[PDB]
Amino acid sequence: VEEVKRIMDLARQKISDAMDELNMDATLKQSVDESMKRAEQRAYELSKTHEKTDALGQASADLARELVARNTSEDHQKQIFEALKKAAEEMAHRSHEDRLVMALILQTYANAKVTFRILNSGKALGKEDKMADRWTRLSAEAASLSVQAINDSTSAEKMAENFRQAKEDAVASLHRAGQDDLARKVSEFADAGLSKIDELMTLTGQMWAHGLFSKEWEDAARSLSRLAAVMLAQASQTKEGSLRAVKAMEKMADNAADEAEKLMKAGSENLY
């Protein structure tokens, strides 16, 4: 419970540093300082009742759904995304403190990018009436998985066991849902070391948007998240691998948001 506070304080000070370096709006800055004060207090509140990884995941999820806020201009939200991306980029320049923290901003940045596009798509399309709230809980599960994957980075057999488990699970899940081709591409991606992490993160994001909008793709999206989280835990052990992880997480966030927009403007009209 005590190690969570150091993670939240360090990551928070890094987004504060990125905010000051970027010449941001003073009101926008201190509003976000209070917004992650909320995540600081919530990190301590949810522990000892929920597990530590679950508390960190919901802290990041509420932090991102917070970072969208209520009435914020598009440039300010883009600037929040820029501050998170730059803070992760500079967190790639370093301890076990750095790797777990950098994943936490990346999970929050990925969560915040997709939530903002879900909410903004309804305003243009006239469908402001709801899917973003579930995505917060789904990414709360996802953020704890990525935290746990980097929590496993101290070992070397837990790494191989988790990697083989997640590769088998992702291939089996896509086979089980009738996607034989995609299952074989996921096997190839998992077979190519870290050289195919960009395409795997693109596919992971697109399936995150599809498992959000339809429950029949949920297990495939979760299994792809497990495989991707293991891979990113392998990447962040080094310096440029942390940088490649930052770029790959950006890839996942952008593709998940693009597929979320495409799915919102396609016939999501049910029937009474």
Author numbering: 4 to 97, 100 to 134, 138 to 280
How is this structure described in the published paper?
Here we introduce Chroma, a generative model for proteins and protein complexes that can directly sample novel protein structures and sequences, and that can be conditioned to steer the generative process towards desired properties and functions. Given backbones from this diffusion process, the Chroma design network then generates sequence and side-chain conformations that are conditioned on the sampled backbone to yield a joint generative model for the sequences and structure of a protein complex. We sought to characterize the space of possible proteins parameterized by Chroma by generating a large number of unconditional samples of proteins and protein complexes (100,000 single-chain proteins and 20,000 complexes across two versions of the models, v.0 and v.1). The experimental characterization of 310 proteins shows that sampling from Chroma results in proteins that are highly expressed, fold and have favourable biophysical properties.
We reasoned that the best way to determine the plausibility of the protein space parameterized by Chroma was to draw independent samples from the model and test them experimentally. The crystal structures of two designed proteins exhibit atomistic agreement with Chroma samples (a backbone root-mean-square deviation of around 1.0 Å). Moreover, the two designs with experimentally determined crystal structures demonstrate that a non-trivial fraction of this distribution should be expected to be atomistically accurate.
